[PDB]
Design a protein around this motif. Structure first.
Motif, short mmCIF file in Angstrom:
data_model
loop_
_atom_site.label_atom_id
_atom_site.label_comp_id
_atom_site.label_asym_id
_atom_site.label_seq_id
_atom_site.Cartn_x
_atom_site.Cartn_y
_atom_site.Cartn_z
N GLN C 77 0.82 -1.21 0.00
CA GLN C 77 0.00 0.00 0.00
C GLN C 77 0.86 1.26 0.00
OE1 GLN C 77 -2.86 1.62 -0.86
NE2 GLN C 77 -4.08 0.31 0.50
N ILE C 169 -4.08 -0.84 -14.51
CA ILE C 169 -3.31 0.09 -13.68
C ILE C 169 -4.08 1.40 -13.52
CG2 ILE C 169 -1.20 1.50 -13.57
CD1 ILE C 169 0.41 -0.71 -14.52
N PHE C 173 -2.82 3.62 -7.54
CA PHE C 173 -1.76 2.63 -7.44
C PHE C 173 -0.41 3.30 -7.24
CE2 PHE C 173 -4.26 -0.60 -10.22
CZ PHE C 173 -5.21 -0.68 -9.22
N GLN C 176 2.35 2.05 -4.58
CA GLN C 176 1.86 0.72 -4.26
C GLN C 176 2.70 -0.36 -4.94
OE1 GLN C 176 -2.39 0.59 -5.05
NE2 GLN C 176 -2.89 1.69 -3.16
N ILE C 178 3.34 -3.64 -6.55
CA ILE C 178 2.47 -4.60 -7.21
C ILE C 178 3.17 -5.42 -8.28
CG2 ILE C 178 0.73 -2.72 -7.07
CD1 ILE C 178 0.20 -3.29 -10.06
#
Lengths: 267, 272, 277
Positions: C77, C169, C173, C176, C178
DNA sequence: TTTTTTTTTTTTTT
């Protein structure tokens, strides 16, 4: 605020009176049927038949007086020593002829050098090079000196400002005008001359295929301007020097600028 | 021993530890006859070999000390062999008319120390080291004038005083020389009069014969100096050697600010 | 002027959790105690910190109490601060000797060795605020994803996890960590970048370290060092390129899978940076 | 207080 004290030129001044001698004291080979007397006096007084503000002399002949040792100091240190050759000539012809800006040209140089032969040592020095023209550009005036002032509000100071920028006047005026300020540009009193940029290309016969010859600009300053024609190879005078657009002056970038005070169309 | 920085390579040792290095075939697995043939020709420019100090002792480590800090050791080497060329002079005593050939400068050209592969393999971890490199010469950049000793004046007095440029930088006094005067007058730098030397640049592909397969080969950035300027014409894969160099660049444009990533080229000591 | 508001997120204790996260563990001696050494031993550079063991370690920190605050979700996050904190404490418990360091041997190893030895020794004369911890590292930190069969512990939704398309996406984001999947395209060649970057000074020397923050910065000279400064007039200073450190950088765009995309809608490639090992 | 730009369309041409 008094000005003390001016200096010097030293050796350059020694070469001033020595080259003054050479330009005055011959400068001659053959007595009688020659090629004698002076031949330069004949040439400058024939140049006073005209007053085109230019001359021709041989470097080969310049050797003979000092055996070329003066030709040396005028050989590498040339750019440094120009201002004296001219006003020394002017001092000499002031004995002979009188709206005068005199232009020096040296020819019949020791050896032709390549563009690949171009190196930083040659800076401020005479050199002979030849090759093919590219793109003659239209002739536009050389400032030489200008009149710009005031400078707040009329200083009318007219001289110099011959630096390569070419701006500006307004430097250390009047007194008392205290500029700074505007120059302010005074165009009308400024005498102008020439000039056109002609980029020479390196000749094919010599260049080693595959090559793609790397070439730079020949600037035509002097009445020798414009005499060239595209495609021809021509003997040139060296004056390596440099041009503004790696170093910077901390309170830049530079490159080769080829000039000639003398050019001939041979080649 | 004259300890130097983090390079920490002892002066007045390497010179001496190279001084006994003289006269060895040996081994191998020349030598002094190269030093010998050099002087009559007066060409300067020691060609060397490398490997030399590898593997022969003394200086088996100094061979590494140059790989580690070439900028230093090349200075020491040229400095030393100037004096060693002087040291060979004492046997024949007066030579070459005379001490001026001792005034004539010399320089070492180390090559073939290890072989590092391409520009592709190149790394930040080693920013100073000599590299065997290949690829064809693309083009010869125009001759670059370079700053050595900057010349200055003023309207005060006007006077001729000039100073060395040193590192790429220019610091003149705001004021003033001669005399004295002093005075507020700004320094007049003649652009042209100052001392200059020859530098160039060439762009080079990395081993066009070789590919990481499939990606395009990265570009070698080279410059050189002196003879190496206009060394060869182009389209020559052959071989290249020199230590790594990198410098940050100004951005937008002007503005006097850094781009915060270093432009990377080669100090390109030698090519054979 | 800049309103400020409390949030449940606090770095304070999480730091401690990171200390107990590393060097204290079993299931994978532990991996965080002597591999960290092997980095300090100089047999390895990349520090691979798995989200896997963040999960299994929270299996040691919850189930198996006492209960601990969220990690992998707090990680993905935010994603950036956890390399500036989780990694910063690594300096504390790193093995000293470590084994067979030598000096040179390695180039610049003696430079930094004699950097802080000449630093402390030139600081020893003055005593008779320190080179930043990021300056001496020689190890990168790489997080790895949890797919995962053991993510089924489960924390359920919190797993991404999925190698979503760039169409998928989103603007939330940002910040973040990922997974993304796609084709490599144009893959800029590897280039050095920069890190601190010590520029030497001219008269009395010393040194100062300009942090490398963002993509660009203002260069500086003047004089910072009090001795070259104010006397006289100011000590000049230049950059020492062997005093510099460069993190490895190769940036490469990754194009969409093209079956991830709606039928219209030309492929949208995204910008990526590479750092490290 | 300034920032920064080469394909695509059409054309006239051996």
């Amino acid at each position: 605020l008094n000005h003390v004290k001016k200096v010097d030129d030293v050796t350059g001044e020694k070469v001033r009176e020595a080259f003054e001698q050479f330009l005055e004291d011959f400068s001659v080979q053959s007595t009688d049927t020659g090629e004698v007397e002076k031949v330069y006096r004949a040439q400058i007084e024939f140049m006073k038949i005209y007053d085109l503000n230019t001359i021709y002399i041989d470097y080969q002949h310049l050797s003979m007086r000092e055996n070329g040792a003066l030709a040396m100091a005028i050989s590498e240190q040339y750019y440094r020593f120009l201002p004296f050759l001219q006003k020394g000539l002017r001092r000499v012809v002031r004995k002979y002829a009188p709206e005068r800006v005199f232009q020096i040209s040296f020819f019949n140089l020791p050896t032709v050098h390549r563009i690949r032969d171009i190196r930083s040592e040659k800076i401020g020095s005479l050199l002979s090079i030849s090759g093919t023209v590219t793109r003659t550009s239209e002739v536009r005036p050389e400032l030489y000196k200008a009149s710009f002032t005031c400078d707040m509000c009329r200083a009318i100071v007219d001289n110099v400002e011959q630096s390569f920028k070419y701006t500006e006047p307004t430097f250390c005026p009047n007194p008392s005008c205290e500029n700074r300020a505007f120059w302010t540009l005074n165009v009308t009193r400024s005498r102008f001359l020439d000039w056109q940029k002609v980029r020479i290309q390196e000749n094919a016969n010599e260049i080693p295929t595959g090559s793609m010859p790397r070439t730079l600009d020949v600037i035509l300053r002097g009445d020798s301007v414009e005499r060239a024609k595209p495609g021809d190879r021509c003997k040139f005078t060296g004056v390596e020097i440099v041009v503004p657009d790696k170093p910077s002056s901390t309170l830049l970038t530079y490159k080769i600028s080829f000039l000639a005070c003398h050019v001939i169309s041979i080649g | 021993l004259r300890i130097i920085w983090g390079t920490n390579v002892s002066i007045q040792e390497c010179t001496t530890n190279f001084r006994n290095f003289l006269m060895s075939f040996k081994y191998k697995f020349y030598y002094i006859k190269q030093l010998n043939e050099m002087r009559e020709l007066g060409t300067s420019n020691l060609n060397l070999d490398a490997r030399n100090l590898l593997a022969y002792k003394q200086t088996e480590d100094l061979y590494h000390q140059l790989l580690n800090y070439p900028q230093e050791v090349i200075s020491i080497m040229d400095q030393t062999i100037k004096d060693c060329m002087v040291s060979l002079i004492v046997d024949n005593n007066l030579d070459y008319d005379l001490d001026e050939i001792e005034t004539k400068f010399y320089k070492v050209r180390p090559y073939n120390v290890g072989s590092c592969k391409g520009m592709r393999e190149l790394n930040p971890n080693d920013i100073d080291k000599l590299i065997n490199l290949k690829g064809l010469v693309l083009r010869s950049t125009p001759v670059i004038p370079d700053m050595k000793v900057a010349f200055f004046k003023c309207n005060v007095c006007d006077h001729t005083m000039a100073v060395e440029i040193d590192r790429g930088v220019i610091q003149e006094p705001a004021r003033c020389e001669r005399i004295d005067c002093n005075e507020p007058n700004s320094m007049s730098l003649i652009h042209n009069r100052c001392s200059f030397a020859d530098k160039q640049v060439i762009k080079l592909q990395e081993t066009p014969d070789f590919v990481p397969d499939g990606q395009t080969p990265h570009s070698i950035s080279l410059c050189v100096y002196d003879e190496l300027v206009d060394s060869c014409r182009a389209g020559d894969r052959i071989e290249v050697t020199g230590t790594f160099r990198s410098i940050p660049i100004r951005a937008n444009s002007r503005q006097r600010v850094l781009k915060s990533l270093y432009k990377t080229y080669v100090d390109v000591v030698h090519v054979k | 002027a800049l309103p400020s508001i409390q949030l449940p997120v606090d770095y304070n204790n999480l730091f401690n959790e990171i200390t107990d996260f590393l060097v204290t563990f079993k299931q994978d001696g532990p991996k965080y105690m002597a591999m960290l050494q092997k980095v300090a031993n100089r047999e390895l550079n990349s520090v691979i910190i798995d989200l896997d063991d963040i999960l299994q370690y929270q299996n040691e920190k919850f189930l198996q109490g006492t209960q601990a605050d969220d990690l992998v979700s707090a990680i993905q996050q935010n994603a950036n601060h956890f390399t500036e904190l989780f990694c910063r404490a690594i300096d504390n418990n790193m093995p000293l000797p470590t084994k067979e360091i030598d000096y040179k041997d390695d180039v610049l190893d003696v430079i930094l060795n004699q950097r802080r030895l000449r630093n402390e020794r030139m600081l020893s004369d003055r005593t008779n605020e320190l080179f930043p911890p990021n300056l001496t590292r020689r190890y990168f930190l790489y997080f790895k994803p949890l797919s995962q069969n053991c993510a089924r512990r489960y924390r359920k939704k919190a797993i991404s996890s999925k190698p979503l398309s760039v169409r998928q996406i989103k603007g939330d984001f940002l910040g973040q960590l990922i997974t993304v999947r796609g084709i490599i395209t144009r893959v800029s060649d590897v280039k050095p970048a920069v890190e601190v970057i010590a520029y030497t000074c001219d008269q009395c020397g010393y040194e100062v370290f300009q942090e490398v923050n963002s993509r660009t910065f203002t260069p500086l000279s003047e004089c910072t060092s009090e001795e070259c400064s104010q006397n006289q007039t100011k000590g000049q200073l230049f950059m020492s390129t062997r005093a510099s450190k460069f993190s490895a950088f190769q940036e490469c765009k990754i194009q969409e899978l093209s079956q991830q995309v709606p039928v219209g809608h030309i492929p949208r490639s995204l910008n990526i940076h590479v750092n490290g090992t």
